[PDB]
Amino acid sequence: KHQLYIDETVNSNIPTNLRVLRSILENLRSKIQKLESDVSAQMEYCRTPCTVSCNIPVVSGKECEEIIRKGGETSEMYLIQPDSSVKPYRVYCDMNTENGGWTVIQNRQDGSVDFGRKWDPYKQGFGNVATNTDGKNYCGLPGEYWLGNDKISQLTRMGPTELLIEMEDWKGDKVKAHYGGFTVQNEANKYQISVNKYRGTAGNALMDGASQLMGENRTMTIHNGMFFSTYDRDNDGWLTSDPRKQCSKEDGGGWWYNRCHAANPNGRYYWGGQYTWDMAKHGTDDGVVWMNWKGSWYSMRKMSMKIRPFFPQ
Amino acid sequence: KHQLYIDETVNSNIPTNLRVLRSILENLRSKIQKLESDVSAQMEYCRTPCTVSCNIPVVSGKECEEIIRKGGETSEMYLIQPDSSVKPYRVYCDMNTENGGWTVIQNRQDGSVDFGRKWDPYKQGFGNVATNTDGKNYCGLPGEYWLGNDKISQLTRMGPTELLIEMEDWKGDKVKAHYGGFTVQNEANKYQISVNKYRGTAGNALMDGASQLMGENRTMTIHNGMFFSTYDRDNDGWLTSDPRKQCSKEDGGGWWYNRCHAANPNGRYYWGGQYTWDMAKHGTDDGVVWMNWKGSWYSMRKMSMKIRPFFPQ
Amino acid sequence: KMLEEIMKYEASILTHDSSIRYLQEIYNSNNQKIVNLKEKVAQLEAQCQEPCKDTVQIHDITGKDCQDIANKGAKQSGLYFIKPLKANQQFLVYCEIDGSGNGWTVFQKRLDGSVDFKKNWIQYKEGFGHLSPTGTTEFWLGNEKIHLISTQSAIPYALRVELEDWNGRTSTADYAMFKVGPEADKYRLTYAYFAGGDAGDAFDGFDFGDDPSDKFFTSHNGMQFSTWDNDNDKFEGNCAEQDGSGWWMNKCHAGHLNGVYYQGGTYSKASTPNGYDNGIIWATWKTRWYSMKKTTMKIIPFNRLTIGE
Amino acid sequence: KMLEEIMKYEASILTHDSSIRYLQEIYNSNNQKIVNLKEKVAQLEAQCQEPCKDTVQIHDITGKDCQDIANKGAKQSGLYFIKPLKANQQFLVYCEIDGSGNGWTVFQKRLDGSVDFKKNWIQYKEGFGHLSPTGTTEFWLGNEKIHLISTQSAIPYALRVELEDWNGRTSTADYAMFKVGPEADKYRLTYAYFAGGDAGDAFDGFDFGDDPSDKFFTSHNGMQFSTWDNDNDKFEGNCAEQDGSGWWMNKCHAGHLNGVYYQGGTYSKASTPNGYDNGIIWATWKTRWYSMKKTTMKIIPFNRLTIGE
Amino acid sequence: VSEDLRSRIEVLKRKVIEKVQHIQLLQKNVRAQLVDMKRLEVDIDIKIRSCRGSCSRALAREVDLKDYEDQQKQLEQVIAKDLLP
Amino acid sequence: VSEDLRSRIEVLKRKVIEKVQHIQLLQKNVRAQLVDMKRLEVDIDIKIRSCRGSCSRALAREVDLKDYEDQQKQLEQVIAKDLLP
Ligand SMILES: [Ca+2]
Ligand SMILES: [Ca+2]
């Protein structure tokens, strides 16, 4: 005789799984009107672009090294020319760190540039190099940018090239990753990457994969010897099947992916390091990362990739 | 013994004066969602305006008369200058009707301009003069517009001025009203109007009031000698009391009203001549009208007010 | 149905009172959306009150001529009002200005056909055509105007003449001491001497080889302007009515720019039922059967540019 | 409550079924605004893909020097690449061109202070400063460059020297036969003769009245260039390290433009703890204690302008 | 101690009357709301065409009165008679 | 000719069950829509900052997760139990 099991309580317990569902449902509904509102404004703002006026330093050379030797002692945008053939290109030269002579190659610092770009833009370069100081005429400070694959592959092949990779917390901490063998092949070879001499505080992610994994797990995040793939041209360590495995999906960074990664300097720029699977556009590690330092699910606040021809130590 | 009077029938007769009231009530309710819908779109469309590029005919003069004598043989927007003082103004010159030389002053043709405007705009002019043809560079065709009170009063006082007033049915018929004494005073004199020599097919409304009335009724619609009043500055033949009598209410045309009117070229633009008291914003004759022709409650399809200095007949 | 049909009546008026109440609930809620709709529209009507944007604008910088303007501080080619020292009322002109300070006051340009050049005397005297601020409009500024500028305050003028084929090549031809006279004098053209122009000097005449008197019979200097309705050329009858224009004719021409716009640029005698040099020609540069693609007559106070840049 | 509390349960599930249905009505309508919002953003992202517009542009017209360029058909002053006949790789220069056809290849300009001129040997050899296309930037093109141009294919060069006070008055000073030598020769300056310049000829020296050997001790012709880290002047020690610059010193100077920018233009010996003619001076024009507001050294193949315009 | 015999007049009539009162009044209210809709409908129609000369593109809409005309007649008709005896 | 005695189980249970079915399913649907909102919200946030390097001026907006975090927890919780016997 179970006439007591009568869940009348359910008829007056269900209003719970209602008022609640009713709450967030209406929440989202409105949030949408806010998101819809905010984007329309940005549409406006873009009726006009940002503009820089970067007068050129008289001095020039093959890269930033030569330039400093010619007296390039300040840090700002210069114009180089690795070869008589290639027409002279602009670039930010770091003349204040090690000895200076750092040909900036990549630079992430405040999320002002979609790196979630295709194969083409990566191959040619994008973003803003330097931008104007204040009252100073020249543009003495950089901005996020990719120097572009050919221009880069073109520089490494010019002779022994060392590579420095710096990064910063959202707390302030900072670490570096120095390699002495950076040499990117040409487009013909899928810009195959290859480094050779680590030394530093960030952790050798590039040729040692992530320090958090092990066994085959580790051996599958080593970027060395990896082709460069973009969301529009896969060159990872995958296999043609259900793209649930494809290292660079939409608006994802272009990089030398291999069974994905240990590091991704051109990843997406999440604000304030900490990001979650429920925030990632596809529930993947979109961010700018260095597992061997900050681990996964933590996007850096700043990260760059400078270059300078190593000369006998 | 009236226990038979029992209107049980009423209890089953009332559902009528229900289902019906229920019908339209729900009708309007929805119609509103349609009207609400349609206006929001128009809001959109206006995020950007219409734009004309009207290159200027080399030729110019005091008004359209002089211009044609200088070889102005086409009909399009010209630029005139009645006086060295007044800066040159644009205007549509009709060079194809009578002899040509018609300085267009007002023009109603497709309801694309709120004439339900205030004192200020009337005094200075509004709307679109000419608009671009097709592939032709210049703007060879007009658009609804008011040349503006000063500019007009300024022209009549320049010397003997004749006035032509044309109008068209929604069927196609067409009639004219020619006056040979048009001379509008200045703002100082409330732009007092005054015509003097009728001849034509529309009926002398301006100085003869409506032909449908009689006695004092007729004598109170004569516009001649009338000041110009707008919905924001009354100068009619009224008296300060309950505005149930005030010739130009909201969004109503600005004109030389007198105990209201016989004609109102700047009235509201109802589509398809026939309009009813239940359609008028205030149950008045808002429309563009000429009683002496089409009578009351019939808005024209087209109506203009061209000018040209009469030269000895 | 004593109270059997009656106990139901006292029961239905409730069913009705419900419907009644409900309808009021809608009628009210309707007056709501209405009162709102009304403000929504006012919101709208306020938006629609400004007429179409007219892309063509005029700069209020005014002068005696385009130079006097560019000098005055101008910085861009466009439409500008000017009033010569002897003028009794200003008038619109298009000025071409370069990054050097030149007030090239223009008076005639062709480039598409738009404007038929067969106009009467008065049409050449007052001016015809349209003036785009960018100059993508054909037009004859009008002799009276041209003259007025050319004879103001004994100011020295020059005339650059830009021409263009249909293969993008161009050539100038300047005439120092440019001056156009009174209607009284039939606007008669007059320049003292030819100057730096690789287009040649069609104004000095041309020996077309048809006859040996051609060079002194096609020269244009000191010649009176002539239309179809007003002949003052040095030929029995009028070259204008023949060619189809208004120009300084003298037993015709060796170089006249108001020639009938021949598309392609190349033509023959098969064109007109008789054939002429009625096309835009400048023999000193190219054949009388070649019609220019573009054409521009502009003046500038001689005191300016001497050779080029 | 047998069926008293029960007839209500079978009545509330409706009230609930209504709420349930309604919520679905929103959840769906939400996925709508979402799917749309998503395209709205793509619409956006496509807009933000082009980097900031960099107002400074370079013209691809290339030559042996600015003249060879203006000759090549150039028409505007700006930044241009050039490569001398003996050059092993081109380099950016700013060219000043006038409406006459002059390719004024510039090599040094001052006007605000922006660039501290106390640079080493290498900095004068390679060049320093920035090049605005408009020339509102200070800079030393660099001797090596200056030389390379000045000694290409036995081409005859001249040097106009534009100076400006702080009261808007200016004066040129040309030096025909301008030529700068090899680093080997310490870039030694050398011009054959002074020419049309109302600024005077500070290069021939100046008798400052301090001593009667001043004129042959302040002249600059045929003098070697010298910085603080590289002395080749005709004075015990280096005038450069003293004045604070790089220049062709010889027992110092009578006119050197790399002088420390003195705001106002007027200065004394109270300036530096010792005082000098270290300011931008050109005595032949104005006092050694007067510092120019602007300054420009530009060369041009002598074959060009003879006197002015 | 004896109601319903004649009570079925006061509880009926006065109720049916109070209920007929609303219907007849209410119906009148609707009439005006309709006259408001016409004007409103129309006025919008104008305000939109007038916008063709100001905005970049205009809404191509009509404004059938037939519908309003219809109800205009129905309700006007429905106003017959209700209760009396 | 004898329903409600045991009918108040089939018309009740099966109805309350069919009604609990939607709630539990529906609640699941909301969960995902929320996970879509987070990502959406965030992604916009990025797409706007990225625009600072292209457009003339950028929208200075934050993106509090606290709110999402909240519901993220509530709904996750509300997923307890409903009907059984
Ligand atoms: Ca003749
Ligand atoms: Ca020494």
Side-chain angles (χ1 to χ4, degrees), chain C residues 209-278:
Chain C
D210 287 47
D211 187 288
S213 63
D214 289 344
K215 188 183 184 64
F216 225 2
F217 272 143
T218 64
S219 62
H220 301 97
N221 211 166
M223 217 74 39
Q224 286 179 328
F225 193 86
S226 282
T227 52
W228 72 280
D229 67 333
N230 185 194
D231 189 18
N232 308 97
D233 65 1
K234 292 291 197 171
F235 171 90
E236 241 293 74
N238 40 65
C239 288
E241 186 186 358
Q242 299 175 173
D243 282 322
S245 81
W247 190 258
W248 330 77
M249 310 293 225
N250 137 71
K251 202 74 164 304
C252 290
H253 49 31
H256 98 318
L257 309 173
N258 302 331
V260 55
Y261 197 86
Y262 286 114
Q263 186 86 21
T266 181
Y267 77 105
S268 54
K269 276 191 171 182
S271 301
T272 29
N274 303 265
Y276 293 100
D277 322 333
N278 71 159

Side-chain angles (χ1 to χ4, degrees), chain B residues 175-195:
Chain B
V175 290
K176 47 165 284 177
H178 188 319
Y179 297 64
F182 190 72
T183 53
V184 190
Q185 223 80 354
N186 54 355
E187 184 178 352
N189 291 129
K190 314 254 195 60
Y191 298 110
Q192 188 178 142
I193 192 199
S194 183
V195 303

Side-chain angles (χ1 to χ4, degrees), chain A residues 10-226:
Chain A
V10 142
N11 184 286
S12 303
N13 152 110
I14 257 183
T16 308
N17 321 260
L18 281 184
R19 283 292 184 93
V20 285
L21 287 72
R22 196 165 192 272
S23 187
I24 100 286
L25 234 335
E26 291 177 290
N27 191 81
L28 307 185
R29 196 261 219 78
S30 60
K31 200 93 62 187
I32 287 190
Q33 304 296 172
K34 171 49 165 48
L35 296 185
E36 218 152 44
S37 173
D38 286 13
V39 304
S40 282
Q42 188 53 260
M43 291 283 209
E44 275 301 327
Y45 287 172
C46 307
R47 284 269 307 177
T48 50
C50 51
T51 39
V52 310
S53 305
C54 307
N55 312 292
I56 331 308
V58 177
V59 253
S60 175
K62 235 88 70 184
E63 75 280 315
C64 297
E65 154 65 15
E66 174 145 45
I67 284 180
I68 187 151
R69 294 198 314 215
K70 285 191 185 173
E73 58 158 312
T74 328
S75 279
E76 65 167 293
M77 191 241 279
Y78 287 86
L79 227 187
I80 73 181
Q81 174 164 224
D83 204 297
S84 310
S85 61
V86 196
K87 286 303 90 185
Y89 46 104
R90 332 175 90 92
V91 57
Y92 196 86
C93 284
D94 202 5
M95 304 313 202
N96 292 41
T97 51
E98 296 276 282
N99 289 355
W102 292 109
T103 310
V104 178
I105 254 83
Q106 180 255 198
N107 181 75
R108 307 298 308 253
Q109 73 194 186
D110 69 288
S112 52
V113 157
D114 183 36
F115 276 68
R117 286 183 215 238
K118 285 171 194 163
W119 178 273
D120 212 276
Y122 266 111
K123 154 192 175 180
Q124 299 158 178
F126 54 92
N128 303 295
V129 179
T131 61
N132 271 107
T133 59
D134 300 76
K136 282 56 63 178
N137 289 36
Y138 60 113
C139 300
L141 49 72
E144 287 162 67
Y145 82 80
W146 178 244
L147 185 106
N149 299 358
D150 289 320
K151 282 118 292 69
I152 309 194
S153 65
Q154 191 256 122
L155 296 186
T156 62
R157 293 190 304 269
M158 188 154 73
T161 316
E162 90 198 275
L163 160 77
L164 168 57
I165 304 173
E166 298 140 87
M167 46 223 266
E168 177 167 318
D169 265 10
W170 281 81
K171 300 288 181 299
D173 284 74
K174 186 167 177 280
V175 290
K176 47 165 284 177
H178 188 319
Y179 297 64
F182 190 72
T183 54
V184 190
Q185 222 80 354
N186 54 355
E187 184 178 352
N189 291 129
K190 314 254 195 60
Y191 298 110
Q192 188 178 142
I193 192 199
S194 183
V195 303
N196 233 200
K197 190 57 162 60
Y198 170 68
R199 186 188 71 156
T201 48
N204 188 126
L206 297 189
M207 69 213 289
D208 274 341
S211 53
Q212 280 94 164
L213 292 312
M214 52 183 88
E216 290 208 30
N217 284 201
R218 189 185 195 80
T219 82
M220 293 309 221
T221 48
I222 278 65
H223 303 276
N224 189 288
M226 242 61 231

Side-chain angles (χ1 to χ4, degrees), chain A residues 211-243:
Chain A
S211 53
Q212 280 94 164
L213 292 312
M214 52 183 88
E216 290 208 30
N217 284 201
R218 189 185 195 80
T219 82
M220 293 309 221
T221 48
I222 278 65
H223 303 276
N224 189 288
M226 242 61 231
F227 295 162
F228 187 90
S229 32
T230 40
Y231 83 83
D232 78 322
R233 186 202 252 60
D234 44 7
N235 287 322
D236 42 354
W238 65 175
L239 44 77
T240 289
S241 61
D242 292 312

